[PDB]
Amino acid sequence: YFQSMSVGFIGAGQLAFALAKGFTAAGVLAAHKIMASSPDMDLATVSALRKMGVKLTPHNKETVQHSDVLFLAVKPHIIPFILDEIGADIEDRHIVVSCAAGVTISSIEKKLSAFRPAPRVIRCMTNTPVVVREGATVYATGTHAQVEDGRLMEQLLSSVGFCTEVEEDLIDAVTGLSGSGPAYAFTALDALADGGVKMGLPRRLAVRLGAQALLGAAKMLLHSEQHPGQLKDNVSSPGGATIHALHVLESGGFRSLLINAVEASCIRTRELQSMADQEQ
Amino acid sequence: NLYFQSMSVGFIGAGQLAFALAKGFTAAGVLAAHKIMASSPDMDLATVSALRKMGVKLTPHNKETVQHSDVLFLAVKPHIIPFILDEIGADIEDRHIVVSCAAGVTISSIEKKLSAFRPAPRVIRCMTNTPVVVREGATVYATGTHAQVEDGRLMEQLLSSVGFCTEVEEDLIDAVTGLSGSGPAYAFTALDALADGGVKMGLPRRLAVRLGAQALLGAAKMLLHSEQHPGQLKDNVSSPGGATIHALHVLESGGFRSLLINAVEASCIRTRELQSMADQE
Amino acid sequence: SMSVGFIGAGQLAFALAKGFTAAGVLAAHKIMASSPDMDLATVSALRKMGVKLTPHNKETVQHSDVLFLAVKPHIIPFILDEIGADIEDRHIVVSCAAGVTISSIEKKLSAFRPAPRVIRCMTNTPVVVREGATVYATGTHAQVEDGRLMEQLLSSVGFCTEVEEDLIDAVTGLSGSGPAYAFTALDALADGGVKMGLPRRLAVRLGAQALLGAAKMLLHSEQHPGQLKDNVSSPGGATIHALHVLESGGFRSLLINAVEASCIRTRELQSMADQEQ
Amino acid sequence: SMSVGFIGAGQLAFALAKGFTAAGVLAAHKIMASSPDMDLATVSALRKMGVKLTPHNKETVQHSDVLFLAVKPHIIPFILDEIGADIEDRHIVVSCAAGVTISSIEKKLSAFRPAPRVIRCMTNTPVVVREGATVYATGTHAQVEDGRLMEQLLSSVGFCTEVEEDLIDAVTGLSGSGPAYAFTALDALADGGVKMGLPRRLAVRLGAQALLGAAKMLLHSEQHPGQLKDNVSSPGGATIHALHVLESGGFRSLLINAVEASCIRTRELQSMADQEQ
Amino acid sequence: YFQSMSVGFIGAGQLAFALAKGFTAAGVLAAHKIMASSPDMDLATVSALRKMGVKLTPHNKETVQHSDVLFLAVKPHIIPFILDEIGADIEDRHIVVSCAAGVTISSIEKKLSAFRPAPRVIRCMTNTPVVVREGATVYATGTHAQVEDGRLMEQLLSSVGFCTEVEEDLIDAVTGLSGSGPAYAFTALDALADGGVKMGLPRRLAVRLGAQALLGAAKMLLHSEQHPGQLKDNVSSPGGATIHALHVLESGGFRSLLINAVEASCIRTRELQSMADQEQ
Numbered sequence A, E: 001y002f003q004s005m006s007v008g009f010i011g012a013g014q015l016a017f018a019l020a021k022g023f024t025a026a027g028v029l030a031a032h033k034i035m036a037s038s039p040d041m042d043l044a045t046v047s048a049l050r051k052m053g054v055k056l057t058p059h060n061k062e063t064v065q066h067s068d069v070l071f072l073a074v075k076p077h078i079i080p081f082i083l084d085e086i087g088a089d090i091e092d093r094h095i096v097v098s099c100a101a102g103v104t105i106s107s108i109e110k111k112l113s114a115f116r117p118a119p120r121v122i123r124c125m126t127n128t129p130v131v132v133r134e135g136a137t138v139y140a141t142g143t144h145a146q147v148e149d150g151r152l153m154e155q156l157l158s159s160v161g162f163c164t165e166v167e168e169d170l171i172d173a174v175t176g177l178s179g180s181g182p183a184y185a186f187t188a189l190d191a192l193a194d195g196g197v198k199m200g201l202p203r204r205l206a207v208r209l210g211a212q213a214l215l216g217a218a219k220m221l222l223h224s225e226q227h228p229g230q231l232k233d234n235v236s237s238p239g240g241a242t243i244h245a246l247h248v249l250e251s252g253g254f255r256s257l258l259i260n261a262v263e264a265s266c267i268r269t270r271e272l273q274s275m276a277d278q279e280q
Numbered sequence B: 001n002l003y004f005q006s007m008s009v010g011f012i013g014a015g016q017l018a019f020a021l022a023k024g025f026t027a028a029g030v031l032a033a034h035k036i037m038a039s040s041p042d043m044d045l046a047t048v049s050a051l052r053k054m055g056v057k058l059t060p061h062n063k064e065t066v067q068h069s070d071v072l073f074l075a076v077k078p079h080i081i082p083f084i085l086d087e088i089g090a091d092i093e094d095r096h097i098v099v100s101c102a103a104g105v106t107i108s109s110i111e112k113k114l115s116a117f118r119p120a121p122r123v124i125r126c127m128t129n130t131p132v133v134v135r136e137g138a139t140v141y142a143t144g145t146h147a148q149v150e151d152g153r154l155m156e157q158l159l160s161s162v163g164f165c166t167e168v169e170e171d172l173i174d175a176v177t178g179l180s181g182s183g184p185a186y187a188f189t190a191l192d193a194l195a196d197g198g199v200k201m202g203l204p205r206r207l208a209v210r211l212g213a214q215a216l217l218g219a220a221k222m223l224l225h226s227e228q229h230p231g232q233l234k235d236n237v238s239s240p241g242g243a244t245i246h247a248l249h250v251l252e253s254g255g256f257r258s259l260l261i262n263a264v265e266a267s268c269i270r271t272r273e274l275q276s277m278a279d280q281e
Numbered sequence C, D: 001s002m003s004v005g006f007i008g009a010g011q012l013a014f015a016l017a018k019g020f021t022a023a024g025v026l027a028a029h030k031i032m033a034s035s036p037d038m039d040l041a042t043v044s045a046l047r048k049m050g051v052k053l054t055p056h057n058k059e060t061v062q063h064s065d066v067l068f069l070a071v072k073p074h075i076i077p078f079i080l081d082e083i084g085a086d087i088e089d090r091h092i093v094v095s096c097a098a099g100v101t102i103s104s105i106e107k108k109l110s111a112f113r114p115a116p117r118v119i120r121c122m123t124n125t126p127v128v129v130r131e132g133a134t135v136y137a138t139g140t141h142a143q144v145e146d147g148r149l150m151e152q153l154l155s156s157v158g159f160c161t162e163v164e165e166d167l168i169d170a171v172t173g174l175s176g177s178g179p180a181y182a183f184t185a186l187d188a189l190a191d192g193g194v195k196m197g198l199p200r201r202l203a204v205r206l207g208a209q210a211l212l213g214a215a216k217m218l219l220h221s222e223q224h225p226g227q228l229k230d231n232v233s234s235p236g237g238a239t240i241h242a243l244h245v246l247e248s249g250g251f252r253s254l255l256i257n258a259v260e261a262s263c264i265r266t267r268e269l270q271s272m273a274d275q276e277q
C-alpha cells in the first residue's frame, strides 16, 4: 500500500479503467485516491470508474494538481496536445508515466522541458489483462527519472501482472507481442470455440474449455523450465489425435501467421511514430 | 475433507497423464503422494522417475494397483485399455470407481468387459489435459450405467481441485478431446511462434517467451471472468488505424481462424476413427 | 420554403431526389438539376418525378438555397470556377464528391466571395429507398444551423451523423462503396441457391431478404455481431459447416481488403487532384 | 381467437414470438411455450413479454391450435412420440426443424391418429425484427385454408411464400444460414473501417446500414444486381478498385461454397436421421 | 421455307422462345405455324411468344395434334412425365426432337414405344444464341428416324446457326462446351468490362468493346485455317501490352479454369442422367 500516493489518469477509456480496476482490486490504491479526466463523460468506462469510486473531472489540469503519479492514457496522437495543455502544471513531485503506444520518451521530455526542466518521465507498455491482475508490462526510465521512480513504478505495476524494466528501444516490439497479444488470443479463442461447435459442443461450453485450455497451457510454460516444443511433445501420443491436429496447423502455416502479426503490429507502431516525429 | 477421506488412488499407466494428475492432486493437498500407486511395465521412463521422486508408490503389477486403489484411473493408451481390462477385470471390486481417461474409449466398451466379472462396475469416463499439473486443467466427465450419484459428485470434487471440471453427456467427449484435450499443444505451438515473432522484431528470446505466455494467460483469464463476447474484448484492444487492427488483418488474410477450426476437427475426427477401428477389432 | 439544386443529374442526384420526395421533406418542384447532357436516363427519370431540369449550372445556382455538387470529383474544380461568381450569402454548398476536401472547395469559392458556407458529405445510393448511410462535415464558414439543417434533410433518407472530415475517405470505402460489395455478395448467394436447386428469382429474393433482416437485427441489437452469429449455429449443424468454408477462404480478410482498397484509392485520387491544383 | 404453441423455448421460439407480438397479429397471452429447462435466457425473455411458459409439452399441445415445433432436429422424433396421442382434429403442426421431412413427421403422428395436418417451414432469426425470410410446404392432410393461415401469420414477420418441399434444404442453406454469413461480413467490414481509421461503433453502424440499404434496393428493383453494382462504380474509381480485390480472392465462390455446405450438411444430417428411424 | 411443316414446342421457356425467334427471323417458319404449350402462361417468354404470333395453349396434347415436328423444351426431369402424357398421341407423321440436356434417345424411345412402335426421335443440343441466328447445334438420329428426318432437321437448325450431326455419345460433352458456353462468355464479358471500367472506360463503352472484341476474334478463328495460338501470336508485339496481359492470364491458370468448366458441366450432365436412369 502506497499511503501517500495520489494517482491520476489523463484519459478515462479502456486502459485507464483496466489499470484502475487492477490497482483497486490489488488493494494497492484506494479508488478515491485515483482521479481520471476525459472530455466525454458518456463512456461506459467513465461510468464504470464512477461506480468504483474513482474521482472524475473533465479538466486535465485538476488531474495534474491532484496527482503524484500521472498516467497518460490517451491515444498517441493526443499526447502532444495533452503535454502542451498541462506542461506548465507539472511540478517537481510528478512522475509522468506515458502508456501511449509508440510515443518516445524523447518526444515527451522535449515538450515538458519547455515549461520546467528535468521532468520525471517513464514510458510503459502494458495490456488490458491488468484488469484481472494478469497484465504483461514493461517500462523504461527517462533522462531525469530517479532510481526510486523506476522501483516505485515496478512495485505498482507488478501488483497487476508481470512487470520488468527494458531499454526503450524494445518497447515497440513488446507492443506488437504482448500489447496486441490479447487480441490474437481473443481471435484464437473465438475460432477454437467455433471448432468445438462444429464438432458438437454447445458454444458456452466450447468457449469455457478453449479459454481454460489456453490459460492452463500458458501457466504451464510460465512455471516450466522447458521449451514450448517439449511441452508440446508431451501432449501428442504417436499416431494420436493431437499430432494429427498439429499437422493441419503446420500445413496452413499457422506459425508464420503469428510471426506476421507481431511484425505487423510492431512495424505499424514504428510507422505511426515516425509520422508523429515528422509532424513535430 | 477429501484429504480427511484418506482416499487411495491408483493409476494404471505411469506416463505423462499419471504424472500430471498425481502432481496436481498432491499440490492441491487432496491426496498424499504415498497414497497414490502407479503401475507400468517400464520403469526406465522419465515419468516414472518423477513419480518416484514425489513419493508415489510404483509397481510393475497392475493387480497391485487395483488392490491398493479406491479410485482407479486408467491412464494407458486407448488401444491398451481392452488388454488391461482383460487382465485386471477379475480384480475390480464393488467398492471401486473406475475412471477411464483414455481418448475415445467408450463407457460401453469398458462396461462390457468388466460386467463379465462383477455385474455392476462403477465406471466414469473423463477427458482432461496436462495443465492439471499446475492445477489449471480443463476436465469433463460422464457417468456410467452403475456409477452412483455420489460417484459423480466425488469425481467432480476431486477433479475440481486441479482445474475446471463439469459433467457432460458422453457424446460430447470426443469433441472436448479435440478442443481442450489437444488444446495445450495448439497453445504451445502458438507461443513458440509468437516468441519467434518477438525475436524477429528485436526482443531477446527469454523475454519474448515470458511476454507471449503472459499475454495468453491474461487474455484467457479476461474471457473467463467476462460476460462479453471474445469479439468485443478484441474490439477493446484495437484503436482505429492502429497497430493491433493491422496485425489482425494479416491473421485474417492467412485464414488463422480456419486453421484452429481445422485443428479441433482433425483431433476430434482422429479420436472417433481410432475408436471405430477399436470397436471393429 | 427551401429550394434545392443539384449540379449534375446522374445516379446520385436521382437517388437523393427520389429519396427526398418519397420522404415528403421536399416536393419535386422545389428541386432543380443541371447536366450538359439532357439525354441521360437519370435526367428523364428526374423530369418524370417533377424535378426542374436545365443545361445551365447558373440557373441551378440561382434557383437553389441548398446546392448539392453531384458531379465526378475531377469535374468539381471546373464547376466551382463556373459558378463561383454566382454564390450568394444565402447559399449552402453541399459537396457529395468522393475525396474532394472542404479546403479545396473553400479555396476556389473564396476567390469570388469570402465566407462560402460549405458542407462535405459522403452518402450512398440506398438513399433512393430511404435507407442511405450518410456522414457530413461542416466547413469553416458553415453556421451551426447549417449543420442541423443538413442533418434533418439527410436523415429523411437514411442514417446521418456529423463526423470530422478526416473520417470521410474511410466512410467512402465502407458505406459509400458498401452497396457494391453487397450486390456482389447477393449475386453470388443467389448463384449458390441456384446451384442447390432454387429458381433464380426465389434465390435472389431470399438472399436479399436474409441480408436485409440480418443487418436490421444488428442495428436494433446491443449485441456483438459474433454473438448474433453464435445464435444461428447449432452444434454440428448446417450453419457452422458453412461458416467454416467461409473462414477457409479468408472471407473476412477480403472484406477488409475491399474497404482498404476503396479508401486508399479515394486518398490517392485526391492527392493527384491536389498536385494539379 | 387463434392460440399458438411452441414446443421448445429457445432462439427461434423467442424470435417468432417477439415478431408475432410486435406485428400485433398475436397477443402474447395467446402464445404458450414449453422447455425442460426453465432457466434459459430465452425462457425469461418470453415470460417478460407475456408468453405463457410450462415445462410440460402436453400443456402446450392442449393450449394450442397452431403448434410450432422449435426443438433441435434430432429431438423432433422424441417429442412426436411424447405428444402424438394428444394431437386432435383442430391442430396444425408446423415443423420449423432444419432438414426434418413432412414424411417423417406424418409417419410418427399417424400411428396415433390418422390425417395429422402438417406444414414444414424454414425461416430465420430476423423474424425477431419482422424482416424474416420464410418458406413453407403443406403436408398430405393440410387443408387449403391451413396454408393460407400459415402464410398470413408468417407474412406478418417477413417475406413468406409456399414452395415444394424439395426446395427447403436449399432454402436452409441460403436464407436460413444466411444471417450468419451477413453477421460475419458485417464484423469484417467493421474491422475494415477500423483499420482505415473509423471508431468501431460508427463502422458497425455504417456497415450494417449499407448492407440493409443495398438489400432493400435489390428487393425494390427489377434490375439485376450486376446493374446496381455498375451504378455504384465510377470509371477508375474507389469502388471498382475494391471490387477487384474481392474478385481476386474468389469472394463470390466463397458464398457459393457456404450455401452449398449448409445445404449438403442439412441433407446429410437428415439422411442419418432416416437411417435410424 | 417448309410450307407444309407445323412445329410445336412442349415447354414455352427460354429455349422455346430462342428457337421460335430464330426460326421466324430466319423466315423458315411463319409464327402462326408454331404452337407452344406451358402450364404457366405468366412467363415473359410466353408473353414474347404471343407478341410474335406463336399460338399458345396450356394443353400439351393440342401441341402434339397441331405439330409435325415436336420440340421437347422442358427441363430434363420433366421429359418422362411429358412422354407419358402425350405418348398415346404420337402419330406416324411426328418427328420428336428432344432438346433436353442429358436425356438419352434410348430413354425417350423406351417410353414412346410402349404406346406405338417406331417413334421417330432426334436428340439435339443447341444454345441460346439461336435467338440471334448464331447458335451452335449438334444432333443425333434415333433408331427409327428416316434419313430424310435428319436432313430435314439439319436444314431447319442450320437456319439459326451452325448445325452438324454427331454420334449421340458426344452430346454430353457438347453440352459442357457450347451448351453452357454462352454463360462462360457472359461471365468473361462482365469481367472484361469491369477491367475496362477500372482503367477509366464508361461501363456502356466497355461492354460494347469487349463484346465486339470477342465476336471479332471468334469470327477470325471460324474463317481462318490457322491455329488459335498463331492468331494469338499475331496480336502481341515483342515486349508489348498484349504479351504482358497474356502472362498475367497464364499466371492465374486461366486455361485450366476453362477446361475445369467444360469438364464440370459435362460431368454434371452425365451424373444427372445416371440418376434419371436409376429412377426408371
Ligand SMILES: NC(=O)C1=CN([C@@H]2O[C@H](COP(=O)(O)OP(=O)(O)OC[C@H]3O[C@@H](n4cnc5c(N)ncnc54)[C@H](O)[C@@H]3O)[C@@H](O)[C@H]2O)C=CC1
Pocket (backbone or CB within 6 Å): A010, A011, A012, A013, A014, A015, A016, A037, A038, A039, A040, A043, A060, A072, A073, A074, A075, A076, A078, A081, A082, A099, A100, A101, A125, A126, A127, A128, A179, B236, B237, B238, B239
Ligand atoms: N486498449 C489497450 O489494449 C491498450 C492501450 N494502450 C494505450 O493506451 C492509450 C489509450 O488507449 P485506450 O484506453 O484503449 O483508448 P480509449 O479510446 O478507450 O480511451 C481514450 C480516452 O482518451 C480520452 N481523451 C480524448 N481526448 C482527450 C483529451 N484532450 N484529454 C483527456 N482525455 C482525452 C477519450 O475521451 C477516452 O476516454 C493509447 O495510447 C494506447 O496505445 C496501451 C496498452 C494496451
Ligand SMILES: NC(=O)C1=CN([C@@H]2O[C@H](COP(=O)(O)OP(=O)(O)OC[C@H]3O[C@@H](n4cnc5c(N)ncnc54)[C@H](O)[C@@H]3O)[C@@H](O)[C@H]2O)C=CC1
Pocket (backbone or CB within 6 Å): A234, A235, A236, A237, B012, B013, B014, B015, B016, B017, B018, B039, B040, B041, B042, B045, B047, B062, B074, B075, B076, B077, B078, B080, B083, B084, B101, B102, B103, B127, B128, B129, B130, B181
Ligand atoms: N498426455 C495428455 O496430454 C493426455 C492424455 N490423455 C490420455 O491418457 C492416456 C495416457 O496418455 P499419456 O500418459 O500421455 O501416455 P504415455 O505413453 O506417457 O504413458 C503411457 C503409460 O502406459 C504404460 N503402459 C503400457 N502398457 C501398459 C500396461 N499393459 N499396463 C500398464 N501400463 C502400461 C506405459 O509404460 C506408460 O507408462 C491416453 O489414453 C491418452 O489419450 C488424456 C488427457 C490428456
Ligand SMILES: NC(=O)C1=CN([C@@H]2O[C@H](COP(=O)(O)OP(=O)(O)OC[C@H]3O[C@@H](n4cnc5c(N)ncnc54)[C@H](O)[C@@H]3O)[C@@H](O)[C@H]2O)C=CC1
Pocket (backbone or CB within 6 Å): C007, C008, C009, C010, C011, C012, C013, C034, C035, C036, C037, C040, C057, C069, C070, C071, C072, C073, C075, C078, C079, C096, C097, C098, C122, C123, C124, C125, C176, D231, D232, D233, D234
Ligand atoms: N454513385 C454512387 O454510388 C455515389 C456517388 N457519389 C459521388 O457523386 C458524384 C456523382 O456520382 P454519380 O452521380 O454516380 O456520377 P454520374 O456519372 O451518374 O452523374 C454524373 C453527372 O454529372 C454530369 N456532368 C458532367 N459534367 C458536368 C458539368 N460540367 N456540369 C454539370 N453536370 C455535369 C454528368 O452529365 C452526369 O449527369 C461523384 O462525385 C461520386 O463520387 C457519392 C456517393 C455514392
Ligand SMILES: NC(=O)C1=CN([C@@H]2O[C@H](COP(=O)(O)OP(=O)(O)OC[C@H]3O[C@@H](n4cnc5c(N)ncnc54)[C@H](O)[C@@H]3O)[C@@H](O)[C@H]2O)C=CC1
Pocket (backbone or CB within 6 Å): C231, C232, C233, C234, D007, D008, D009, D010, D011, D012, D013, D034, D035, D036, D037, D040, D057, D069, D070, D071, D072, D073, D075, D078, D079, D096, D097, D098, D122, D123, D124, D125, D176
Ligand atoms: N436459430 C436459427 O437461426 C433457426 C433455427 N431453426 C430451427 O429451429 C429449431 C430450434 O432452433 P434454436 O431455437 O436455434 O435451438 P435452441 O437450442 O435455441 O432452442 C432449443 C429449445 O428446445 C428445448 N428442448 C430440448 N429438449 C426439449 C424437449 N424434449 N421438449 C421441449 N423442448 C425441448 C431446449 O431446451 C431449447 O429451449 C431447430 O430445429 C433449428 O433447425 C430454423 C430457422 C432458423
Ligand SMILES: NC(=O)C1=CN([C@@H]2O[C@H](COP(=O)(O)OP(=O)(O)OC[C@H]3O[C@@H](n4cnc5c(N)ncnc54)[C@H](O)[C@@H]3O)[C@@H](O)[C@H]2O)C=CC1
Pocket (backbone or CB within 6 Å): E010, E011, E012, E013, E014, E015, E016, E037, E038, E039, E040, E043, E060, E072, E073, E074, E075, E076, E078, E081, E082, E099, E100, E101, E125, E126, E127, E128, E179
Ligand atoms: N436455356 C438454355 O441455355 C438451353 C436449354 N436447353 C434445354 O432446354 C430445356 C428447357 O430449358 P429452358 O427453356 O432454359 O427452361 P425454362 O425453365 O426457361 O422453360 C421450361 C419450360 O417448361 C415448362 N413446363 C414445366 N412443366 C411442363 C409440362 N408438364 N408441360 C409443358 N411445359 C412444362 C415451364 O413452364 C417453362 O415454360 C432443358 O431441358 C434444357 O436442358 C438446351 C440448350 C440450351
Ligand SMILES: O=C(O)[C@@H]1CCCCO1
Pocket (backbone or CB within 6 Å): A235, A236, A237, A240, A241, A242, A243, B103, B177, B181, B182
Ligand atoms: O494426442 C493424443 O492422443 C492425446 C489424446 C487426449 C488429448 C491429448 O492428446
Ligand SMILES: O=C(O)[C@@H]1CCCCO1
Pocket (backbone or CB within 6 Å): A101, A175, A179, A180, B237, B238, B239, B240, B242, B243, B244, B245
Ligand atoms: O492497436 C492499438 O492501438 C493498441 C496499441 C497498444 C497495444 C494494444 O493495441
Ligand SMILES: O=C(O)[C@@H]1CCCCO1
Pocket (backbone or CB within 6 Å): C232, C233, C234, C235, C237, C238, C239, C240, D098, D172, D176, D177
Ligand atoms: O445451423 C443450424 O443448425 C440452423 C439450421 C436452420 C437455419 C439456421 O441454422
Ligand SMILES: O=C(O)[C@@H]1CCCCO1
Pocket (backbone or CB within 6 Å): C098, C172, C176, C177, D232, D233, D234, D235, D237, D238, D239, D240
Ligand atoms: O467508385 C466511386 O467512384 C464511388 C465513390 C463514392 C462511393 C461510391 O463509389
Ligand SMILES: O=C(O)[C@@H]1CCCCO1
Pocket (backbone or CB within 6 Å): E235, E236, E237, E240, E241, E242, E243
Ligand atoms: O501487344 C501490342 O503491342 C499490341 C498493342 C495494340 C493492341 C494489340 O496489341
